[PDB]
Structures are given as C-alpha cells and as structure tokens.
C-alpha cells in the first residue's frame, strides 16, 4: 500500500480516479486500525481547521484544502457525512482515509449519520460502490465506518460532534465507554450525537422531523456548556445558507462545507479556523459557479 | 483561555442580530468597521436590512462607509429602499448616501428597489424619487461631493470628497446624468451619481 501514489492519483484531478479495489480495501483496513487505536471521544488541541458535511462533493473538498492548506500544512477535524448524495463519494472518503493514515495525529474524522450502513444503503454510497466496484467493498467500508470516533473536544472548550446534544449525555465518560465496532442504534446517546438538531422554537427537547432523535433548544445548549465548563458546541448536519450559522447567542455553531448542496441550494460552504488562542474565524467556499461615472451625451 | 470569534465576524453578526451592546464594544477591536465579508456585505448592510435603527445610526455616526457596495452594487440605501423603510432612507440621505448610486446587473437606484407589493411602498418610493427630482433644486441647489474626482474633460469640475457646491443647471443641457455646478469660483459639469444631498460623517 503506497499512500503517496494513491494520494497523487486522487489529487491529479486538480473526473473519476481509478484506484484498485485492493488499494481502497487497504485504505479502509489501515484506517480502521488507527481509529480503534485512538479514543472514541477525541481530545484535540488548536490550531486546527474544522469542516462540516462534504457528501461526496469531491471537487469542493479539494477547494477546502486549497483554501486551508493541504495536510499536513494545517491540522483538520472533519465532522462527518463524507458519503452519499454527491457524485464522487469514493474519491472523497478515499482521500480523507489516506490523509488519516499519513497524519493520524494531525488529521481527524468524526462519524456522521451517513457513515452508517442503514443510511448509505439508500442515499447513494451503496449504489456507487456497487456500480464502480462491488458489494463486498461496501461492506469493508461499513466495518471501517463502524469504528469512527463520534465526538471531539478541542482544548476542553469546544465540543464537536456531527449532530448535537442528547438527553442521555450526562458525562463525557458515557461517550468514552461506547465500544467499537458499532452500528448507529435507533435511539440513545450515539444516535443523538449523530442525528439531533438545534431549534430556536423548542423549549427543551422537541420532536425531530427526520423521525430520529430530538431537537434541542437554546437553554439545553447553555446548561450543557455550563455543566461541562465548555464555551462552544461545533456541529454540522444541517445545510446553512452562509456555510456557518450561530445558535443560542453564539454558544453553538453549525458548519456545512458542501456549497450548492445537492445542486438544489445556493448555499456557501464554510470551514472554521481555530488558532492557538482559541480565536475562531470562518473561511467561506463561495458556490463554484469611486463608482463609475456616467458617459457624456 | 476562552473561545472568541473574529471581531469582524462579531461586528457583522451583532449588527445583523440587533445586539447593540456588543456592537458598541466590538467595533473598537475591528481594524476597519467598513470592511465587508466575502460577498461585499458590511456591518451597516446587516443593520439596515434587519431594521435595527439604533445600530444603523451608531455605525453611521461612527463614520463607516455609508455607500459601501456589495458584489451586485447594493448600497445601504439600496437595502433600506428594498425594505420600504423611508425613515432609514431619510437618515441615510442626510448622512451622505449616494442618491443616484446604481446597482450593477440592472442599473437601478435605491428608488427603483422599493417593493411594489409590500407595505410602506408609497411613502418610501415617493421620498426617494422625490429626492431624485429635487436634488440640486431644493436647499438652494446645494449639493455635496461624496467621492474624489479628477476631471476627464476640460468642462468638468475637480471634486474633493465633502466639497460643497451649488447646482446652477441640471438635466436640461443635453446631459441627463451630468449637472452644471459651481464650486467656489469655478463652474463645470459634475457626475450626478457621486453627489449627495448632505455630506458624509467623517470617521
Ligand atoms: Mn449531511
Ligand atoms: Mn448528517
């Protein structure tokens, strides 16, 4: 398994990239062991860039790295949803897994609700695997997705996860004790961490139109940060018009990194840069596609 | 060690959200409060679009660029007009707004942006069109340059920003967009889209 060769062929579209089935298998197998050798609740330090959903928009992932600096020039934390919907989920996850193997201490992937064999069975990734390779490769990705970490804390101040808060989340130790490999359950802590949404019109825990997990209001955010001495929740999971959106007086931020999501929205993508002093700023991926005096009459 | 957001990002968001208390603090930590985001939107744009009048005043009294244009050429006056917000429209005009500033894709002024089917349309459009009509006639024809201008023709007045001039002759001498003005002891054409009813507030 030659990672420089693999990354080179993936970066050459800077259009499909033809990696071999065994190369892709090796990416899943080596990254899986690294995921299991690190905690399921990551403890990270700034500086780092944090990115939201990509959903197989491979050319936008390259734009993210051009803007933010290709690994290892910058440290990265991705918050999940790498596959499904977009046309190039395979290139997207293969490059992220390749970077994870190259720089396992400077490159980090969180599990999103689409890193799940029940969800990506129907939303595109299963079809992409079957079309370009076979079903057995899709099952290898599942074994690897089942070992992804699910949350991260940056300098004990920024709680990061794909979805959001959970009624079942009383202490960070309940995250740490979730054993891997695991599927995404229908309900409970792991499910909520990958599936829940904030909502300005909800007091407490509301219903979630996805049919999964809950919505949570601004007071839940404030209570969670106060109890755990956190300053910020950083999550993804929802397309937002400007690529990033504040909630609950900037105690929560939603990050979304796929511009013109699904080709249906005109949204921008954003990533958040956290520097060594925890000063946070946003880099925007614009959708890829005196004043002048009058003339004399 | 605490989480903090980029002060410019705080100025834009607090101006959009109506957190006037934060606007007053964070503005002294931004290098240029007129600096826009990645689409040309400034703090004044957000305050005007969201209707936070006290913030609109504060930013304008602070000396921000009352005529900052976005990617489409939208000025704060274009924004106020599209909200049919005649009161903000009048305060901007009294604060140096380029009345005849035009957007790029359509060549429309703020008056053209008033929304036909929303409330406040009659008063807001009649104010702005009325200002376009009586500009250089009312107030003894007194007008103010909002930008510098080195002349491109011999019959054009040089303008410094803030110059106070009198419109001797407008829109009736084969020039609909240039006006014959007097600046001190000289007369000459001036371009209408760089002029205001009142001068800017100095930063
Ligand atoms: Mn998603
Ligand atoms: Mn999601």
Author numbering:
A (entry chain A): 7 to 20, 26 to 300, 317 to 324
B (entry chain D): 920 to 1122
Please share excerpts from the published article on this structure.
For the most abundant of these phosphatase catalytic subunits, PP1 and PP2A (phosphoprotein phosphatase 1/2A), this challenge is met by a large collection of accessory subunits, which recruit specific substrates, prevent promiscuous dephosphorylation events, and/or tether phosphatases to discrete subcellular locations. In mammals, four PP1 catalytic subunits encoded by three genes exist: the broadly expressed PP1α, PP1β and PP1γ1, and the testis-specific PP1γ2. As well as their PP1-binding RVxF/RARL motifs, ASPP proteins have C-terminal ankyrin repeats (like MYPT1) followed by an SH3 domain. Our data show that ASPP proteins use their SH3 domain to discriminate between different PP1 isoforms based on their C-tail and provide structural insights into the function of the PP1 C-tail.
We solved the crystal structure of human PP1α7-330 bound to ASPP2920-1120 (hereafter referred to as PP1α:ASPP2 complex) at a resolution of 2.15 Å. The overall structure of the PP1 catalytic domain is very similar to other reported PP1 structures. ASPP2 binds to PP1α through three surfaces of interaction, covering ∼1200 Å2 of solvent-accessible area: the RVxF motif, the first ankyrin motif and the SH3 domain, respectively, burying 530, 120 and 500 Å2 of solvent-accessible area. ASPP2 residues 921RVKF924, constitute the canonical RVxF motif, which binds PP1 hydrophobic pocket in an extended conformation similar to what has been observed previously for other PP1-binding proteins. The second patch of interactions is formed by four acidic residues from the ASPP2 first ankyrin motif facing PP1αK260 and PP1αR261. PP1αR261 forms a network of hydrogen bonds with ASPP2D932 and ASPP2E938. The electron density observed for the PP1α:ASPP2 structure allowed the modelling of the seven conserved residues from its PPII motif (PP1α317RPITPPR323) bound to ASPP2 SH3 domain and forming the third surface of interaction. PP1α317–323 adopts the characteristic right handed type II polyproline helix containing three residues per turn. The two conserved prolines PP1αP318 and PP1αP321 sit in two xP binding grooves formed by ASPP2L1113/W1066 and ASPP2P1110/W1097, respectively. PP1αR323 is tightly coordinated by three acidic residues from the ASPP2 SH3 domain: ASPP2D1074 and ASPP2E1075 from the RT loop and ASPP2E1094 from the n-Src loop.
